[PDB]
């Protein structure tokens, strides 16, 4: 795996994970992000 | 907090096998995450209070 | 059946790589601890060569255990009976003989 | 490495990082997440 | 790629992505994180 | 079509690699389970050599199933007919013959 | 021009690896579906040997198409005219001859 | 300095690999475009052998341009002068001769 | 047990790899520091050949220390006794002899 | 001590790979700039063969510098004295001679 192309994929997967975690925290217990 | 002990176990045998279908990695022990608000928060839900109003 | 009674070819590898607790930040002071109690359980890269007729019997033995269910075995290395487990045991079926490449990892339980 | 398991591991690591960042921003300066 | 060194890089990239996503959600529509 | 009639010359690779559930405890102890309910499936690394005129028939047979679908085959290893699927079947052309390399995977279905 | 009219060397690889839909969790029950309608479009690893003078014509032909613009070709494998596309076509320019290494992946449109 | 005068002995690699825009639709259909506007640039895997006294001149010539900048060269492949850039030029010294292995990349500039 | 008495036949590999702190500035300038305080430790890629009866003794010696712990050894390189640790010691069995391969890492401790 | 005064074996590699600033999006227009002032600082894969007695002296010289502390050296390539740094310098100790494999990267400061 070449680093330059993999870094963008890792960044975008991180963005997706952050969005999913934010939406999860807006639930009842959570943290309300 | 720093890759000081990721190489402490060296992760070599797991990394060379990336993982498995039988077993999962990245367990991420919830020790310090569940204790951030306090030990009393892990046992009780910390009842809330209304916002202070200047009208009062 | 609980005993591997077949014979292995001359060239067999024995790997140990024991399990220890290592603490060393950068290239400074280092500390080493024996970690567990059963430190190294070794690993034998066993190879066999058997006539085509006994290949079925050998694979029946290895298949019945099926990864779990360790069996007794006396390696020609230290001549002490141990308990081992196999998980791959690939095979190659030539015109008159078949060769088995298996990995025996020693266990405790 | 094989792509599937690597992507899954990256997703869980991203979720953990997002949770840590959220809990960090709830401190004094931060952004209050 | 050795796993021990790559995991820290993935964690830091995840932290950066989480911060970027949080700052993005504080915009008009968003979620206000 | 249902049955594979061609024959494998050189000595194939028959890989078992059963799937097990393994837990590693602390000081040398462990816990093992067979994970699944019906054995392991086992795969054959098969290679055919055929005249250039018959390679078209073999290609048609291997392409009709097309990765999915299963055909009967009696491996020259245990002589028990099994259901297999082929998914790659690379083939190399020569002056008068064609050499097929393929991976047959046994399937319950 | 729309037809590849050169001759290929004896050794040529033909890979198929069709496209199927596979559903299988762990090592349990498995389901396979044919996926698309044009299942496998194969791939031919073509090698050519041409005098240094005609290498210019061969590269002009392969370069005008330029990755897109599939062209007609009759492989010496099944003798059926198909439409193929090339994307690499590396070359080695020896003292008197040149060797072309190209990949022809067949298409539909 | 503009022109490359040294000569390439053994037979070089002339790689084209054009860039195309490819979309794969469902049941075997696709959509292809040439992506760019001016062909593919093509690269040469060049290798020189020179007397030990002339290697200094070759390295001075290859270092003056220093990765960037372009020089004229007529490849012994199509005999059309092109502008190229070299960025690695590994060199191996011996008792009486020095062997250079370099990668010349054609540039519009 | 403290001292290693067996002898190394073939010609080992003695790798130093000092650890330094290096900063690379802009137009060709840099800044280097020795990072640590006490030299570099160096590691030896050692191989033994032993009769099949003494292999058990060698294994017992290398297993008593078990990855951690250090033993004295005078390498046939500088003839200065040093403290070393071994952590892998792979071994290949043969008809009349056993060939050990190991990595001895020098330790201050 | 500040001058590597030993002799290197015939076959040694000299890699240059200069540092340039490249801007090119996709396969469109490209712009190249010389980047820094000391563009290419090369790298010499030096190999030595020395009797077992002088191996200690050579290793002491290489270890005292210890990664940092560049030293003066005249490569047999351009015969111009430069300042170089070594970082690995592995060694192999045969029955009568020892070979050194070192990497010399030249510096400015």
Curated annotation (Swiss-Prot), chains A, D, E:
> Which organism does this record belong to?
Escherichia phage lambda (Bacteriophage lambda)
Q: Which family does this protein fall into?
A: Belongs to the Lambdavirus tape measure protein family.
Could you state what the record's PTM comment says about this protein? Cleaved into mature protein H* by an unidentified protease.
Q: How does it assemble?
A: Interacts with the tail initiator complex presumably through its C-terminus domain. Interacts with the tail assembly protein G. Interacts with the tail assembly protein GT.
Function in brief: Serves as a ruler that controls the length of tail by stopping the tail tube polymerization and is probably released from the tail shaft during infection to facilitate DNA translocation into the host cell. Assembles into a multimeric linear form possibly stabilized by the covering tail assembly proteins G and GT. Its C-terminus fixes the tail tip complex (J, I, L, K), thereby forming the tail assembly initiator complex. Tail tube proteins polymerize around tape measure protein, displacing the tail assembly protein G and GT.
Instruction: Spell out the subcellular localization from the entry.
Output: Virion
Please state what the protein is called.
Tape measure protein
Swiss-Prot record, chain B:
Asked whether the keyword Protein biosynthesis is assigned, the reply is: no
An example Gene Ontology biological process? viral tail assembly
Cellular compartment(s): Host cytoplasm
Record keywords: Host cytoplasm, Late protein, Viral release from host cell, Viral tail assembly
Q: Which GO terms describe its cellular component?
A: host cell cytoplasm
The family assignment reads: Belongs to the lambda-like tail tip protein I family.
What is the recorded function of this protein according to its Swiss-Prot or TrEMBL entry?
Answer: Plays a role in distal tail tip complex assembly. The tail tip complex is assembled successively with three tail tip proteins J, one tail tip protein I, one tail tip protein L and one tail tip protein K. The tail tip complex interacts with tail measure protein to initiate tail tube assembly. The formation of the tail tip complex is completed by the addition of tail tip protein M, which is followed by tail tube polymerization. May be excluded form tail tip during maturation and would be absent from virions.
Q: What is this protein called?
A: Tail tip assembly protein I
Q: What species is this protein from?
A: Escherichia phage lambda
Swiss-Prot record, chains C, F, G, H, I, J:
The record's keywords, sorted A to Z, are: Host cytoplasm, Late protein, Viral genome ejection through host cell envelope, Viral long flexible tail ejection system, Viral penetration into host cytoplasm, Viral release from host cell, Viral tail assembly, Viral tail protein, Virion, Virus entry into host cell
Q: Which gene name does the record give?
A: M
GO process annotations (BP): symbiont genome ejection through host cell envelope, long flexible tail mechanism; viral tail assembly
Task: Say which species the protein is native to.
Answer: Escherichia phage lambda
Q: What is this protein called?
A: Tail tip protein M
Q: Which domain of life is it from?
A: Viruses
Where does the protein end up? Virion; Host cytoplasm
Read off the InterPro entries from this record: Phage_lambda_TipM
Family the UniProt entry places it in: Belongs to the lambda-like tail tip protein M family.
Q: Which GO terms describe its cellular component?
A: host cell cytoplasm; virus tail
Its job: Part of the distal tail tip which plays a role in DNA ejection during entry, and in tail assembly initiation during exit. May bind tail tip complex associated with tape measure protein and allow tail tube protein polymerization on top of tail tip.
């Amino acid at each position: 795996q070449i680093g330059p192309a993999a870094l963008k994929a890792v960044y975008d997967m991180a963005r997706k994970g952050a969005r999913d975690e934010i939406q999860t925290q807006m639930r009842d217990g959570g943290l309300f992000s | 907090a720093g890759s000081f002990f990721t190489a402490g176990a060296t992760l070599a045998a797991w990394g060379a096998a990336i993982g498995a279908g039988g077993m999962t990695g990245i367990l991420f022990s919830l020790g310090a995450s569940m204790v951030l608000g306090g030990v009393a928060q892990m046992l009780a839900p910390k009842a809330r209070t209304p916002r202070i109003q200047t009208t009062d | 059946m609980k005993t591997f009674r077949w014979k292995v070819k001359p060239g067999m590898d024995v790997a140990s790589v024991p399990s220890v607790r290592k603490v060393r930040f950068g290239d400074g002071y280092s500390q080493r601890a024996p970690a567990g109690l059963n430190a190294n359980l070794k690993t034998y890269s066993v190879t066999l060569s058997v006539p085509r007729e006994e290949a079925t019997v050998l694979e029946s033995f290895l298949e019945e255990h099926g990864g779990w269910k360790s069996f007794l075995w006396t390696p020609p290395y230290e001549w002490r009976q141990i308990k081992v487990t196999c998980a791959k045991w690939s095979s190659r079926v030539s015109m008159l003989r078949v060769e088995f490449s298996a990995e025996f990892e020693q266990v405790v339980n």
